[PDB]
Amino acid sequence: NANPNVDPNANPNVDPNANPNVDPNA
């Protein structure tokens, strides 16, 4: 899960998830 190149802190104003019925990359 941990990776030094990635900051594990979500923006409170953005839901950090995706709808499985929709391709996340549009």
Epitope: N3, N5, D7
Partner: antibody
């Protein structure tokens, strides 16, 4: 606007040293870390070394261990690479790279690279 | 000491075709595989953030998949503008490991 600007190349006769640098611009190097990526002409990319901010994490590729040293000028926001006892195999373009990922998307930042010839 | 390998070192396909580039690692990448596109003479650009995650600004034609030690980059509707050497990057720690690079040309 974020840029990484490399300088300090040239022709180094075998056995001589070279000191390369990458000037940070548009950001303060106070977060993740800086990488040197080497590419001999006609060859693929080779990561050479990383200096993590404040020097807590220093790593090198096996091919340069004991020959290359990296450090930062903490006043000029500039990353330096000390290359000692250079050999012919070290001919390459040395690129400054600053990759990290942080919530909103990826960041990479590549410079243009400094050409170092060792013949 | 993690080796990165791109088996299809050279590929070629006509314009509009589909190019499949595989990538393997001797140790787990665990989806932290970045894909880069290097046009000769230029610094490489990041295409794929991580396994199956395309970077914004990178054409939707690019896609990929993988996990563990086995990954693939797919180039749909291949264009002349895609002739580049593509590279695998492992970013699981404080430093990066690169693959050999695969050259994709046009038939």
């Amino acid at each position: 606007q974020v840029k990484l600007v490399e300088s300090g190349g040239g022709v180094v006769q075998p056995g001589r040293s070279l000191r390369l640098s990458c000037e940070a611009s548009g950001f303060i190097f106070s977060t993740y870390g800086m990488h040197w990526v080497r590419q001999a002409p006609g060859k693929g990319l080779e990561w050479v070394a990383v200096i993590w901010f404040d020097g807590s994490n220093i790593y090198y590729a096996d091919s340069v261990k004991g020959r290359f040293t990296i450090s930062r000028d903490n006043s000029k926001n500039t990353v330096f690479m000390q290359m000692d006892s250079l050999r012919a195999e070290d001919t390459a373009v040395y690129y400054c790279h600053r990759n990290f990922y942080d919530g909103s998307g990826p960041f990479d930042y590549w410079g243009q690279g400094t050409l170092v010839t060792v013949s | 000491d993690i080796q990165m390998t791109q088996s299809p070192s050279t590929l070629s396909a006509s314009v509009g075709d589909r190019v499949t580039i595989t990538c393997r690692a001797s140790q787990f990448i665990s989806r932290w595989l970045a894909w880069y596109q290097q046009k000769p003479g230029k610094a490489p650009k990041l295409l794929i953030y991580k396994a199956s995650s395309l970077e914004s600004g990178v054409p939707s034609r690019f896609s990929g998949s993988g996990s563990e030690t086995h990954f693939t980059l797919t180039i749909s509707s291949l264009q002349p503008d895609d002739v580049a050497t593509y590279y695998c990057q492992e970013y699981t720690s404080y430093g990066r490991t690169f693959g050999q690079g695969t050259k994709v040309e046009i038939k």
